[PDB]
Design a binder for this molecule. Sequence first.
Ligand SMILES: Cc1cc2nc3c(=O)[nH]c(=O)nc-3n(C[C@H](O)[C@H](O)[C@H](O)COP(=O)(O)O)c2cc1C
Ligand SMILES: Cc1cc2nc3c(=O)[nH]c(=O)nc-3n(C[C@H](O)[C@H](O)[C@H](O)COP(=O)(O)O)c2cc1C
Ligand SMILES: O=c1cc[nH]c(=O)[nH]1
Ligand SMILES: O=c1cc[nH]c(=O)[nH]1
Lengths: 341, 341
Amino acid sequence: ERLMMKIGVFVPIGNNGWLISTHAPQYMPTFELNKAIVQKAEHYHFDFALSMIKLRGFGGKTEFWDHNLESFTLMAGLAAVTSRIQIYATAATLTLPPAIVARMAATIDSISGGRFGVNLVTGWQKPEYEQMGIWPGDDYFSRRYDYLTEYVQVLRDLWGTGKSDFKGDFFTMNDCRVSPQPSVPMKVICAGQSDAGMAFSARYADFNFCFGKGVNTPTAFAPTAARMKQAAEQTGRDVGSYVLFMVIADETDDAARAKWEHYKAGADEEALSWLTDPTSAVNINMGTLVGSYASVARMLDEVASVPGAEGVLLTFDDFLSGIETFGERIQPLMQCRAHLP
Amino acid sequence: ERLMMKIGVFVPIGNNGWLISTHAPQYMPTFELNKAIVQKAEHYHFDFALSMIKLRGFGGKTEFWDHNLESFTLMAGLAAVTSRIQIYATAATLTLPPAIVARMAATIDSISGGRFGVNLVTGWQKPEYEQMGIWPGDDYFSRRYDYLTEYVQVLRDLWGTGKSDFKGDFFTMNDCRVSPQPSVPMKVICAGQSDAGMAFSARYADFNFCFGKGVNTPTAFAPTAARMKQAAEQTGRDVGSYVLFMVIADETDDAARAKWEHYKAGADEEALSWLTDPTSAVNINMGTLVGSYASVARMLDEVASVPGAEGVLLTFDDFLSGIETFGERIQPLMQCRAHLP
Ligand SMILES: Cc1cc2nc3c(=O)[nH]c(=O)nc-3n(C[C@H](O)[C@H](O)[C@H](O)COP(=O)(O)O)c2cc1C
Ligand SMILES: Cc1cc2nc3c(=O)[nH]c(=O)nc-3n(C[C@H](O)[C@H](O)[C@H](O)COP(=O)(O)O)c2cc1C
Ligand SMILES: O=c1cc[nH]c(=O)[nH]1
Ligand SMILES: O=c1cc[nH]c(=O)[nH]1
């Protein structure tokens, strides 16, 4: 019952991170920026770094997510300039054959010395795929986890034995070979929120990402983590929840709130239209923690007490300064991080 | 007419490099080995590093190319730990959608600061693709450069304008978007030996790889480079030849020959069966230069005089020692490298 929680950083592979506002920091996703971010996160003992994959943006004044790097190649570069932090890339399974993902994962396993894992996603936004002629049709919405189930069986064969003879509705392996196999058991993580998605995660994932909920209501996601725990019961597997939040912290509650309101007041409404104390569309209605460093520490400790919650995935309004103030001012106050040096 | 030639290293992304022999150095392709190789090549002013993609091996006593990393992720890692050498990854175009390759190339452009390019290949070995159910059928042999022509049109649209509406027999783009665009014009290279392959390279490539020929007959490839020059005439484009050789050099001709014979005497005949002063199957009948450091320097200077030859792509019997003796003993004697510091 002693508080212990893992901390990850959701790295800005897309421009402007997760704020859709002309008052938010404006920046392009460069390798050097993400290198600075992940090296600083590693310095402050963040447990992992994850990048999403986003194949189409939302336009507007800030050209929001119009500029995005590719996840496996970004994480391969970050693996080469880190030494301790876990590194996860996202595979949009419609865009990469499973044997290619299998070999890419083995490659970054080699780059990182065993620190690499894969976030498997089905894809949900039809424009990302229709734009390049690979959308399977609106049958995909209901069948996508059948597809993902075949996909991961191929991956598990290849990582586990170096070969696959899997034959299904979507893939045909005829003694497919991928070697080297990963030096350590390959980590698979998933971000399913639906019943079907959580059932997939319960069978195949090491843990499951879910959305934090509300502004300064850190435990509001609890029913989602409860559903994941029950999905995991149905496989007997230990598959905890990692919860996505944005942290907007400052010296005082008032100063942090002033920033949050300043961001909301610059909302890039044209971009928000394309994408279409309450949450705000300015950060895609993300669960948000806004307060003094001590207030954010207290609220993150609350997250750690939720049944099934094993970690948080953090975005910030400003990653370079936000990681620094998290490491210097927030994390030392967190009971659930007392295990760190 | 003053000798000037570029030098590249063909990095061992597959186990044991390019020797199929129990008397050859035995090693796995690791990131750390390829990092040591490319950093040493960069130190000696090699112009570029290229990795192939090989999705299935040939077995035998040495499990030859049974163990292979993936090219884009390997080169992304190498880009992060280099600063001057050009970095090329190979895309087997049947395995990756063009918009994904486009974004991966933009990503390694960002990692490398503008040092990245793509070697586009159609694929030729049916088992590499049939094993994962993606071989298009034996029509592909005659249509593969039609396919590659559509593929590169999509790439050129995306790198050039950030978007594509290309519609063809093999791809359908509906306002496909990839941004960021590369910071510098994206380099495309090809390795076509056939009439159709050279015609593709003449239209779309910056240069074309061809095979060196014979043992210690450095200019024997000349008719191939002559055919490439004539293909380039038909587009008005400047598309030179880069010639693949293995270098087996030592203090004396006799010592280098003794190594070459020692390698041939350990030929892994079971692996050679699967793959199926003369060239030898022990290095896939590669053009090979065997001699003292001074003899190899003289022969490489001969290569530089061949019409159309602009560079060489080098393998070695031992990459770590071979790059060192190339930099310390061979390159200082090469008239075509007198431009280096
Ligand atoms: C932290 C997190 C990261 C995600 N990253 C991606 C991504 O990179 N690409 C993607 O297509 N979907 C991504 N998703 C969406 C999920 O894969 C999933 O489709 C979504 O949570 C809806 O759940 P469902 O698939 O069970 O309906 C992400 C979700 C979460 C919570
Ligand atoms: C230096 C070099 C590297 C090559 N690398 C690859 C590779 O990584 N993957 C591949 O499928 N083919 C590779 N090839 C084969 C060529 O793409 C091409 O198919 C072959 O040279 C035959 O020429 P053609 O396609 O015009 O018939 C390579 C060839 C050369 C000369
Ligand atoms: O799907 C996604 C990806 C990144 N961030 C989100 O909030 N949702
Ligand atoms: O096709 C190939 C690839 C690497 N080396 C070769 O000799 N041929």
